[PDB]
């Protein structure tokens, strides 16, 4: 929660840096992704199929987003 322009993306960028190093336990080293809601509507029903395929690989692999 913050003003539109405080650095919301940088919060997740710093957490991924500690995973590569070694300051994160192996039980918490999860893959960080950027769920883009606009990428699902690429090109000129279909939205329900692309949304389920993305929200499925993260559950079977246990990773944050």
């Amino acid at each position: 929660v913050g003003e539109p322009g405080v650095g919301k993306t940088a919060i997740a960028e710093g957490l991924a840096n500690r995973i590569v190093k070694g300051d994160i336990p192996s039980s918490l080293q999860k893959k960080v992704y950027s769920l883009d809601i606009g990428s699902l509507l690429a090109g000129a029903g279909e939205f329900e199929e692309r949304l389920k395929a993305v929200l499925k690989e993260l559950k079977e692999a246990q990773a944050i987003v």
Partner: protein, 55 residues
């Protein structure tokens, strides 16, 4: 919720591999009447099975 299902067919039906998984998530459509074809045809070739309705 997973070990209780695997032990159900491995003890009563004497076969842990007779367990189907129906992930109720992608079937949320309007044409799921004459298509689910999938669950009826699977239990026809094997009357001794366990049907799981995940989510």
């Amino acid at each position: 919720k997973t070990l209780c299902v695997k032990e159900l067919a491995a003890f009563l039906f004497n076969d842990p591999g007779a367990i189907v998984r129906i992930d109720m998530s992608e079937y949320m459509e309007k044409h799921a009447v004459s298509r689910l074809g999938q669950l009826t045809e699977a239990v026809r070739r094997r009357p001794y099975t366990v049907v799981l309705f995940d989510e």
